[PDB]
Every structure is written in structure tokens, then in C-alpha cells.
Amino acid sequence: TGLAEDGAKSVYERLKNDRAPYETRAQNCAQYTIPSLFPKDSDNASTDYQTPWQAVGARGLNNLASKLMLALFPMQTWMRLTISEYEAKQLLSDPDGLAKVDEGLSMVERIIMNYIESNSYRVTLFEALKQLVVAGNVLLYLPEPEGSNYNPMKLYRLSSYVVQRDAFGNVLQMVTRDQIAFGALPEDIRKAVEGQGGEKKADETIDVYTHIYLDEDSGEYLRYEEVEGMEVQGSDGTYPKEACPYIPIRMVRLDGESYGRSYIEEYLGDLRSLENLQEAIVKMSMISSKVIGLVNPAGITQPRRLTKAQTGDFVTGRPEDISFLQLEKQADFTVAKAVSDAIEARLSFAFMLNSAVQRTGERVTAEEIRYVASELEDTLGGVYSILSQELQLPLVRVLLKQLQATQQIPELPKEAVEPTISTGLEAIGRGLDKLERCVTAWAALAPMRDDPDINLAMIKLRIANAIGI
Amino acid sequence: ASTDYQTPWQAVGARGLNNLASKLMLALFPMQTWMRLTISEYEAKQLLSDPDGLAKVDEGLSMVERIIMNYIESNSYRVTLFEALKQLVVAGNVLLYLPEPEGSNYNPMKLYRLSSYVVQRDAFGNVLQMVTRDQIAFGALPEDIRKAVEGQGGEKKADETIDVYTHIYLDEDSGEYLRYEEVEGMEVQGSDGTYPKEACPYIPIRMVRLDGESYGRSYIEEYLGDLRSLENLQEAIVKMSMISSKVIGLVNPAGITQPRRLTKAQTGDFVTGRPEDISFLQLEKQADFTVAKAVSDAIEARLSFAFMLNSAVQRTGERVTAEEIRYVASELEDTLGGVYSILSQELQLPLVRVLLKQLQATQQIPELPKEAVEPTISTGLEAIGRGL
Amino acid sequence: DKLERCVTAWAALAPMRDDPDINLAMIKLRIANAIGI
Amino acid sequence: PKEACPYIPIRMVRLDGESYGRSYIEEYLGDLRSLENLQEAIVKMSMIS
């Protein structure tokens, strides 16, 4: 039936081999930065996950994830909706349309955020964010609200799914490979496994494959989940192109690449060098630690007598004879240390660790949000923009498709019932700045109100025009 | 996907390029405002104390000001133009196309990199003809062009690469352009239309123009030679140090060491030997190391001064918005190059130019009078802020 | 926090209440809208 | 009820396909062990003196 083709498993393995290289570079990145975050396919519990010899990678990766999370999903607000595309008709002094908007959208603003708290999307998206900054891609799915019970977004790591794109980048088809134990499987898919046969112990691994793909007739997607080769009725449905329930997100896009590349990947080469050099200093020092008593046979020491002495006992011997193997590498040690420190500085400047200006006087909330913003863009990369387009705006996009539907639509009019989401700095805060500027300008207008030889009406009009009103 | 993309041995290039893109973006598309329109060419007639024409202007243009910016937010032109800006500062050219508004659904500007299109100019620089080479997968292709591929034949899997070529070119009779998109050798009815010369829907932008050059040159290109040197020198220090790291036990045979006994000892065991015999191959390059480090640091300072990284005065007390915008402006011009002006003429003013052709049409034209219904856009510092 | 921000904004509104050539109702509405209410 | 389980098993750092947790210090165990070794040598070296 079209590009459903062989079935969910086979298309999964096909695209899987093509995805393999991104997976491998995600793996190496992991070993260099932080081992336990992205594991080896074969390994289960037994794996060692040796900490890398250097810790700059781990500390910086973690700090970068934090800063990105704080600047991207701040506590106070994270989005704005403004009335659009009918502006020329009513934005011109109808205070009601704007007031209903202030009300309807404020309802929307608060609710969406409130729903967010409950479902703990903060923690879930933070972990997905760290996963994406260490590796190529992350896929997050928002399931139906299900009333009071929370439905947390689930991050599926790059190793467990697949996405295909064209040279442009459109979402052609994606296949997830989640494994859910027999018992945990929903009663419905459980019924599906049961009909094929297989009454099972709670333990059996049942694999669910979601195969969202493109329709050759309609510009829609056609989801369906299956166990093995047999399709099961997982609510086959036509989700709109603009909002896709699953959200594949790439760290740094490229032309003609159906996947993402981690940001740390760009700095992997310097990082690896640090590891090597550091390894040598740690190792070099340990060799020095061994104390290997060196004696000159020609001499009269005869170490037996020396070992025998209890403290403060005068055995025969000579000072010159007993000596200790030291390590003479001193120039080497200095060169290594200096080069390593410079490399550490570089890695650090990029990782927004050791930037050295904003740290003084840290105080969360407030408006720390504005400053930490640009600096992230300045040196991490403009990556804030890339993620912002991909995560912040879409995450809201799907929430709006669902939340508005399950609750009540306010009295807000019909031109904004399909509102246009805006995120980022334009959306950070709400504007009060223009107002405080203008009333400070008016406060500087203390001297005279019966000010002769001047026009009161117009000067106050000009002060008003200085800031948008 | 397979490509290694090795990080260059030096990171000054990456850090500075990124910071330069940021500063250029912040100064060029600030949050508070990015353009001004002032009534012009009828001024002698009414600018002389008619408070209404000015008031309608304050109103009509303020509507315009806010709307254009608002539409901009939605379509995420901030992120898209930021990436196009970085692409242009690293390379020769960038081409951005604003498609029809399509109502509520956003239509983001798409940057096409220098490798995927072509623009021809004369010695003067006029836009003669341009051809894009975008590849869109069969299924993703719009139903219309999809119909076009279907009629030639070729019912296809969603996968097939279908190539779309937009060939905007100059007319030998009219001073207009005649767009048409095609798949392979067969023209398809991609809305053949006559877009006005003043506003071209696609916008080819050059970083640093030159006489008789139909393309652009990246700004970093001017500093490529110093940059390459840094790479070479730095490579040597990184490599030199690693050679030092290897510990290669050197023993004097004439001596009585016989390393077997030394390796054997558990900690704190007195094996026979002499201190002099065991020694370690060090690296004696010290003068060399100092010369390299100093020259590299000076080169780093140069690259930095140009890249507006390590300028050292404005960093203290950073606070976004406010009027940081005025100062960061001149300094960009001062040392990056006057490039702010060049981009400003090319991107900021035209980006608005096409938005005005479209936005004013899809919405409502305010009560603003007919002498400003075709307003004259102004950008840059003259346009930064409003005047207070 | 929002409340203290808003009353500080209102305290900065000391100069004139019979402030001519301006709209009292709406400016106070905008200051109110600056912080969620 | 499934939503509230009277007992609460808690994992420090979860992983895919792992029915247990890994301590956070575990991630830094390797550097830590090295410190132990080097420090041991200084304490011991001094006592010999």
C-alpha cells in the first residue's frame, strides 16, 4: 500500500545502516565527554563506562546543557502570541479586541505553561537537550492528554529510531523501535499480540514500531504501530503537516543530510588531544610515585642492615650509595602543562565555561534571562536560534493543537482562534520597558507646566512618540 | 554523512567567526526596531504644519512598523537570516526567497547556499539571470509540479530526487524578470510572472562587491592568509608537546642497571642500580617553543582585533536591548569593516522592500494618504530607534 | 515578584496624575500587562 | 494504583534497557581512584623519610 512497503521492521533496518555513521560519531563523542550518557549497543549493565582521563569535557558539556536549558525554558515565560493578519482591520484603536486578546491569550499563556509543569516537560526536555548536544538527534512524542494523569514527553535516543529526509529536509518517514515488555504493553496492542498467538509471561520483549510516513496523494502523514510483521490498529490517523506529534530535532542541520550532528562533534578533535596529553601527565606522575631504592654495589651499603634498623639506629653505610630513580622529564612536563592549559582555555571559551564576566553576582530569574541569552548565541554558536526554531516553537505548536481542544476556548475572537506562535527573545518577557522610559522622560519634565513660549500639547506628543505606543 | 569535518587545530577562527556573526546579527536585526519610513517628495507641500498628514503618517506607518515586525517574528526570519548571515560571512554568496504569505501558515525564508545556485551579472552588477538547483524529494514536491512530473511519465516512489530550477532572467523587451520553474528539460507552469525590477522576490547578496565580478567574496577570505599561518604554527606546538609526552626509558648499557630488576620491584624495594644510568629523552626545543608561542599570540591578537573579539572595552557591563544598539554599531563598522553599511544596503533595506510589496497587499492599507502609499524605506542608524 | 515589580513601576509614576496630553487609563493598563496579572 | 506506588524505587541516572540505577560518583570513579593512588605515594614517601 504505497511506501509502507516491506513493513516497519525492514524499512527500519534499511535506514538503520545509513544512520549508522552518525551513531558511531555519537558513540565516540560519548567516550570523550561523558561515558554513561550514550551507551554501546551490545553493552547492558556490565559495561565499565570509564570516565575519560580529562574532565573538562564532562564539566563543560554539563554546564552548556544547563545554560541552554535555563535560557530556553525559563521559569517566568517562554512564548508570546500576538494578533496577526487582520491587524489593519482592528488593531487600530479597538480596545476590546485587544482586551479579549489580552485575556484570551493570557489564559492561553498561563495554561500552557501550567500544563507544562505538571507533565514535567522541564526535566524531560532537559535530558533530551543534553542528549542532543552530545549526539546527532532526539525524538520526542507528546501523547494525548489523558485528563488528570500526566503524560510525560518521552525522549528516544538516536540509537533507537530513524528519520529520512530529502536533500531539502522534509520529514518523509520515521520509524521508532521502542521495546516494551509484554505485560506493560497496552491492553489493545496486547490484544493484538494475543491474536497472532503467543500468550506470554510479563517478560517477553514486544517491539512497537511507529511508522509515520508521507502520503503520495495527500500532504498528510499516516501513523500506525505494529508488532513484528503484523500491523495493529494503533489509531491510524492523519496528523496535519504543520504539527507533527513526534518532533525530530537536529542540532546543526546541513544540506542533503537526513540527520543531525552534535555540537560537541565540531570540537571533538581538540578535545581528543587534551585527553591524550592529560593522559600522559597523569601517567607520568604515577611512574614517579613508585619508590625503587637504587644502591651502588661498589659501595658498602649492603641494604640488609639498613632495612633492619629500627628508628634511630646507626648502621654502617655511606650517604652517596643509596639513591632513588627520579624522572628527569621537566621541560617535557612544562610544555605539556602549558599546551594543555591553553587547550583547556579554548575548549572552555567555546563551552561557555570560564567566560569570566557574568558569574559575578549570580541571581536566578530576575532578568538574568536577557543577558545569558546573547552570550549563549555569541560563543556557543548561534545555536540558540537553531534550537529555538526547532524546539521551542514546535513544542508549543503541538501543545496548542491538543490543549485548546481538551479544555475550553475562551471568548477570544475567530481571527486569533488559530493563533501564530512566537518564541525566543522577541517572545522573552512580554515587552514595561517602553513605559518606564516614557514616564522617566515625563518625570524629567518637572520644571514648568504653565511653560510659556512653548507648546504643551505637542511636546508631550513627541515624548510619547519616542517609544512605540 | 561520512565526512570527518576535522576541527581545525586552531579555534580562534571558529570562535571569532561565530562571535562576528552574532554581533552582526544583533546590530542588524535588533529586537526593538529595525527600520523607519518618513514621508518624502511632497514635503514642500504639506510637511509645513499640517498636523493631520503627519498624524495619519504616525498612525499609518506605525501600523506598518509594528506589523512588518510582527509578521517577521512569526516567520522566524530572525533565525533564518542569522544562519544566512553566517553562511555569507564564511562564503561568497547567499540567496534568500520570500514566498507568498499563505495566510496563517508561516512561510520561512529559505537560504540556499552558494554551492547550489548561480547568479550572473555584468561589469556593472545588474541581476541578469539566476538559476537555483534545489532538490526536493518526489513526494514533497507540490501537487502541481508533481502533476508536471507525472504527465511526462514517471510515477515514483516518495524517494526520487526531483530537481527544481528557478530561472529568473532579464527580458530583452521589458525591464522585467520572467520566472518559471522546471523539472529537467521540461518547463512546468510555475506561475510565470513579471516581478518588478525594484523588488525581486529572491535576494542575491554579496559580502564585498567588486567591479566586474558577478559574485561575492567572504569577509574572512580577506584574512585567510594570516589565519592559515596560525594553523600551521599551532599545529606544531600541539604536535611538539605530544612527542614530549611519550616516556621512552633511556638506559646506559655501560651502566649496571639491567632494567629487568628495576621493573620487577614492587613499591619501596631496593634493587641494585645507579642514579646516573636511567634517563629520559626530553625535547630540547625551548627557544623554539618561546618564539612560536609569541608569534602565535601576536597573530591571535591581530585576527582578534579584526574579528571584534578581544576588543576589550565594550564587554564590561553587558546588558541587551537598552541602547547597546548605538555603540555596538559604530565599532562594528570601525574594525570589522564598514561592512555594516554594505550589508545594510543589501539586506536590511531589500528584505523590507519585498515584505512591503506583499504584506501591504494581503492585509489592509490604513487611512494613510496616497503620497505615502508607496513609501520610501530607510534603514540603518538613521533608522535605528526613531529619533526623544 | 511580579507584584513588587509592578508597584515599583507605579512608584516610578510619581510626576503627574493630572498629566495632560496623555491617557491615564491605558498607560496604567500597559504597566499592569507588563507582568502577568 | 499504578500512578501511586507505595514503595518508591528511585534511580540516580537512568539508562535505556537497565532495570537499575548508577550512582553519580560512579561517573567520576576513575579520576578519584587515581587521586587515591598518587596521594598514597606522597603519604608513604614522607613516612620513609
* Strand pairing class (A80-81; A421-422): antiparallel
C23 φ, ψ (degrees, to nearest 5):
-105, 110
Pairing relationship of beta strands A225-227 and A230-231 according to DSSP bridges: antiparallel
Q: Which residue has the cell 513579471?
A: B194
Whether D47 and chain B come into contact, CB under 8 Å, resolves to no
Q: A137 exposed, middle or buried (CB, 10 Å; 0-12, 13-18, 19+)?
A: buried
CA atoms in the 13 A half-sphere facing the CB of B59: 14
Contact between residue A12 and residue A162 where contact means Cβ atoms under 8 Å apart: yes
- The C-alpha cell at A156 is 528516544
Sheet holding B110-113, edge to edge: B110-113, B93-97, B202-206
Grid cell listed for B255: 651502566
Task: Please give the residue of chain B at the shortest CA–CA distance from D40.
Answer: B267
How big is the A-D interface in CB pairs under 8 Å? 49
Burial B59-77 (b: 16+ CB within 10 A, else e): ebbbbbbebbbbbbbbbbb
Put simply, the answer to whether A422 touches B103 (Cβ < 8 Å) is no
Kindly determine whether residue A282 and residue D27, on different chains, have CB atoms separated by under 8 Å: no
Distance from CA of A107 to the nearest CA of C (A): 10
Residue type at A326 in one-letter notation: Q
CA dihedral A231, A233, A237, A241 (to 10 degrees): -40
> From the candidates D15, D28, D32, which should be mutated to test the interface with A, based on the most A CB atoms within 10 A?
D15
CA-based nearest residue to B114, from B131, B138, B95? B95
Residue with cell 582521563: A53
Read off the DSSP letter of residue A50.
Answer: P
Whether chain A has a CB inside 8 Å of the CB on C28: the answer is no
Distance from CA of A388 to the nearest CA of B (A): 8
| CA pair distance A356, B49, nearest whole angstrom | 55
Distances from the Cα of B226 to the Cα of B229, B297, B304, B336, angstroms: 5, 12, 11, 16
The answer to whether chain C touches chain D by having 3 or more C-beta pairs less than 8 angstroms apart is no
Do B247 and A280 touch, CB atoms closer than 8 A? yes
What is the 8-class DSSP label of residue A309? P
Distance CA A123, CA A152 (A): 10
Cell reading at A291: 619508590
DSSP label of B91: S
Q: How many CB atoms sit inside 10 A of residue A52's CB?
A: 23
Partners of A294 in beta bridges: A323
Contacting subunits of B (3+ beta carbon pairs below 8 A): A, D
Please check whether residue A100 is in contact with residue A416, taking contact to mean a CB–CB distance below 8 angstroms.
Answer: no
Residues of chain B in contact with residue A325, where contact means CB-CB under 8 angstroms, are 262, 273, 275, 278
Q: 10 Å Cβ neighbour count for C21?
A: 13
CB contact under 8 Å between A215 and B273, yes or no, is: no
* Helix (H) and strand (E) counts in chain A: 14, 13
Using the Cβ of C36 and the Cβ atoms of chain A, whether some distance falls under 8 Å is answered with yes
List CB contacts (< 8 A) between B267 and chain D.
41, 44
Contacting residues for A185 by C-beta, under 8 A, at least 6 apart: A193, A206, A208
**Solved using:** cryo-EM
Going by C-alpha positions, the residue among A334, A327, A333, A331 that lies closest to residue A291 is A327
Would an 8 Å CB–CB cutoff place C3 in contact with chain A?
no
Q: Find the distance separating the first CA and the last CA of chain C, reported in whole Å.
A: 12
Q: Give the DSSP letter of residue A73.
A: S
Q: Report how far Cα A131 is from the mean position of its chain's Cα atoms.
A: 6
* Residues whose CB falls within 8 Å of the CB of residue C4, separated by 6 or more in sequence, listed in order: none
Task: Inspect the interface and report whether the beta carbons of D41 and A289 lie closer than 8 Å.
Answer: yes
Whether D22 contacts A31, CB under 8 Å: no
For residues C26 and C22, give the distance between their C-alpha atoms in angstroms, rounded to a whole number.
9
CA nearest to A350 within chain B = B15
Query: Which residue in A133, A187, A182 sits closest to A155, CA to CA?
Result: A133
Cα separation, C13 vs B185, in Å, equals 69
Query: Angle A121-134/A8-33 helices, nearest 10 degrees?
Result: 80
User: In the structure grid, which three cell numbers stand for residue A168, read together?
Assistant: 531539502
Q: Alpha-carbon distance B31 to A425, whole Å?
A: 8
CB contact at 8 A, A76 and A48: no
Q: DSSP assignment, residue B49?
A: T
Distance CA B118, CA B214 (A): 9
Tell me if chain D has a CB within 8 Å of the CB of B268: yes
Do A134 and A261 touch, CB atoms closer than 8 A?
Answer: no
DSSP string, B206-258: ESS--TT-SS---SGGGGHHHHHHHHHHHHHHHHHHHHHHS--EEE-TTSS--
Burial A415-433 (b: 16+ CB within 10 A, else e): bbeebbbbbbbbbbbeebe
Burial of D49 by CB count in 10 Å (0-12 exposed, 13-18 middle, 19+ buried)? exposed
- The answer to whether C33 contacts chain A (CB < 8 Å) is yes
- The residues that bridge with A81 in the sheet, in sequence order, are A421
